[PDB]
Amino acid sequence: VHHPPSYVAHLASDFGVRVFQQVAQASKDRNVVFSPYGVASVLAMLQLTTGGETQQQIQAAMGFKIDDKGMAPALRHLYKELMGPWNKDEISTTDAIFVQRDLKLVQGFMPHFFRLFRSTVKQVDFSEVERARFIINDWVKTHTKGMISNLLGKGAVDQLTRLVLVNALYFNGQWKTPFPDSSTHRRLFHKSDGSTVSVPMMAQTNKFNYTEFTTPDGHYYDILELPYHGDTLSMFIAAPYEKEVPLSALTNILSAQLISHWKGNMTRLPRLLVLPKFSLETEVDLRKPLENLGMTDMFRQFQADFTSLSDQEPLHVAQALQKVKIEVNESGTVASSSTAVIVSARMAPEEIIMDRPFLFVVRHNPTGTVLFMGQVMEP
C-alpha cells in the first residue's frame, strides 16, 4: 500500500487547505500566513478530548479518525520524516495538551493520549492565571525556536480555562539557489489603508519547475516552484497572468490534490523570478472556518461534548486560533506556526488586512505535507 506517512500527510493537508480556503473566501485578497499542517495536528488531538457529535463532526471534516488502526503511528512516523536531518532544511513540530490538574479526567484518557501522540499530558493550574499563561507561552516560544513568544496575550486565559491544545511548527529552509542582494531594488507598495511601504524586490533568472493552470472560469495561473537546498521541500508561488484576475478564482478551487497535480505537471523552464522580500505576521481566528467545515458543536457551550476528556463538568471550545510568522529573504525562508484550541479564553478581535496578493505554499514533497501557505501583497 501507499507509504503511511504520505497517506496521513495528504489527509492532514487536504483538511488544512480546506480550512485555509475558508479564511480566504471570507476575506477577499486577505494578506495572511497559515499552516494547514498545524491546524490538522491540534484538531487530531481534539478528536481524543472530544466525544459524541462534537467528535463525529471533527472526524467527518478531517476525513479520518486518530483512534483508527495505524492512524496515530503513521502521523508520528510523519513527524519524524519531516524533522529528519536528511531533509537538510529544518522542520520542527511538537504538539502539547494542557489540562487543568483539577479537572478529573476520564479513566484511560491520559495514558491513551500519550500512546497516540507521545506528547505527554501536561497538568497545569489555570487559577494561577499569569503562571499558566507563562507555562504555555514559554512552551510555544521554545518549540517555535523563539519565533512566536506571545501566543497567549494577557487576559487570554483564566481560572475558567480547562483545556488548551497546541501545535508548534517551525521551518527554516535555504533556497536551492539564493537571490542576489535586493536591498537596492526596493519598490513602493501603495497599500489600501492609504499607506506606502518600500518592499525590496528579489529577482533572479534561472530554471525553475513551472506549470500553467487554468481555473474553471478559464483564468490562467502561473505556478512556479522555488525549491529549498535539501530538495525535499519547496515553495510553490502562484500568480495570475492578468493583473485583473482576482486571487479568489484560484483559492475557490485550491486543494491539496490540486497542488499535488501542480507539482506533477511541472517542467524546468528558464524564468526571471521576481519575489518580494517580506515578513508577514498574522493571527487567524479559526472559529468560522472550522464551523463552515461542519465543526459547530465544539464552539457552543451546551452542545460541545468533551466526555472523552472528562465528564466532570460541561466544556466547549472558546477560542481556536493560529498565529503564524513568515520571513522570506534572499537566503531562504524562516516560518513558524502556533495553533491553539482553548476551552475558555478571550481572543483579541481578528485583524484582517487586504491587499491584492499572490499565493505561496511551503510543501514537503516526499510526503505531500503542505506546511505553510499564505497570501502576500503582490507589487
Side-chain angles (χ1 to χ4, degrees):
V1 306
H2 273 298
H3 184 53
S6 295
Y7 172 65
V8 298
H10 188 90
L11 269 285
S13 299
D14 178 284
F15 170 73
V17 173
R18 274 187 282 125
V19 178
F20 173 77
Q21 174 169 64
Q22 293 300 322
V23 357
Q25 297 178 335
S27 304
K28 180 182 183 293
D29 294 333
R30 188 187 180 179
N31 285 205
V32 64
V33 218
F34 181 81
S35 177
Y37 179 73
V39 60
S41 291
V42 187
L43 271 275
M45 289 196 287
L46 194 57
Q47 286 195 26
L48 291 188
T49 69
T50 206
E53 271 211 285
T54 308
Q55 179 183 87
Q56 224 153 71
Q57 288 177 331
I58 297 174
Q59 302 170 311
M62 294 194 74
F64 71 83
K65 316 214 293 75
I66 190 61
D67 231 324
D68 291 356
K69 182 214 302 180
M71 276 302 94
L75 271 173
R76 256 143 42 211
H77 186 181
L78 178 59
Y79 302 141
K80 300 184 174 187
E81 294 208 331
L82 291 178
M83 301 196 268
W86 51 85
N87 287 286
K88 199 168 192 178
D89 296 282
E90 180 167 17
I91 291 171
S92 178
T93 183
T94 320
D95 289 303
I97 180 177
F98 299 91
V99 292
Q100 178 59 83
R101 61 164 187 62
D102 247 12
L103 218 282
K104 194 282 180 182
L105 301 183
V106 160
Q107 170 170 199
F109 175 82
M110 301 185 81
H112 182 43
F113 184 88
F114 173 82
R115 182 181 180 182
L116 296 192
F117 297 96
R118 293 286 198 282
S119 47
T120 316
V121 191
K122 230 175 306 297
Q123 297 177 107
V124 293
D125 185 37
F126 291 108
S127 291
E128 297 178 62
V129 182
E130 288 307 314
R131 179 57 189 162
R133 188 161 75 91
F134 174 96
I135 293 177
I136 301 173
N137 283 352
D138 186 61
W139 180 91
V140 173
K141 172 177 184 169
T142 292
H143 300 265
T144 59
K145 299 290 180 302
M147 279 194 88
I148 306 177
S149 58
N150 271 99
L151 177 63
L152 272 42
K154 194 279 179 180
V157 286
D158 47 45
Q159 346 81 231
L160 309 180
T161 305
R162 297 302 140 118
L163 171 72
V164 38
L165 295 160
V166 198
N167 170 256
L169 210 205
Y170 177 84
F171 168 65
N172 192 301
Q174 181 185 121
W175 295 130
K176 214 284 224 289
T177 54
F179 291 78
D181 172 67
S182 65
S183 58
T184 60
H185 285 77
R186 306 163 67 88
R187 285 186 58 175
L188 293 187
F189 281 43
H190 306 290
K191 301 186 169 184
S192 298
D193 71 330
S195 76
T196 304
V197 59
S198 184
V199 180
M201 300 306 287
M202 307 185 287
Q204 74 163 290
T205 303
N206 240 114
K207 289 192 185 191
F208 304 96
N209 239 357
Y210 160 88
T211 183
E212 56 271 21
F213 170 79
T214 81
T215 59
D217 47 340
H219 289 131
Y220 257 91
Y221 271 87
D222 167 85
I223 314 297
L224 182 143
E225 176 186 32
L226 181 56
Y228 288 100
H229 73 332
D231 284 323
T232 66
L233 296 128
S234 61
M235 182 189 278
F236 292 73
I237 299 170
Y241 285 37
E242 289 70 52
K243 63 245 293 182
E244 200 70 67
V245 184
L247 197 54
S248 59
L250 181 53
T251 56
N252 286 349
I253 61 180
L254 225 201
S255 72
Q257 288 189 28
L258 175 61
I259 295 175
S260 183
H261 297 349
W262 284 347
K263 176 63 178 177
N265 292 123
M266 295 182 155
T267 63
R268 290 184 60 77
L269 302 182
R271 318 189 83 263
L272 197 165
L273 185 57
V274 185
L275 182 66
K277 183 177 178 174
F278 64 87
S279 291
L280 232 182
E281 183 163 7
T282 56
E283 185 168 285
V284 178
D285 172 4
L286 306 171
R287 180 163 191 189
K288 300 211 82 301
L290 291 177
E291 289 181 321
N292 292 355
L293 294 184
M295 297 161 272
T296 46
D297 276 345
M298 57 167 78
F299 299 101
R300 294 171 294 188
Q301 181 172 223
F302 308 110
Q303 290 184 60
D305 191 285
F306 277 90
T307 64
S308 295
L309 178 63
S310 119
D311 41 61
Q312 171 191 309
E313 52 187 57
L315 303 171
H316 80 276
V317 178
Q319 302 293 351
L321 55 89
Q322 181 181 85
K323 197 167 189 180
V324 188
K325 290 185 53 180
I326 189 166
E327 299 180 335
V328 181
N329 62 31
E330 306 91 339
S331 181
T333 294
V334 182
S336 200
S337 183
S338 188
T339 132
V341 167
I342 315 169
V343 173
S344 174
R346 305 282 186 63
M347 190 195 120
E350 182 177 43
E351 176 194 58
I352 301 179
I353 298 299
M354 301 180 267
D355 286 295
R356 182 179 181 71
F358 65 101
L359 181 80
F360 72 84
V361 177
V362 178
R363 187 177 188 271
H364 178 79
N365 304 309
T367 58
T369 308
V370 5
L371 309 148
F372 294 89
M373 79 187 299
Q375 295 175 163
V376 189
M377 187 190 321
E378 197 175 37

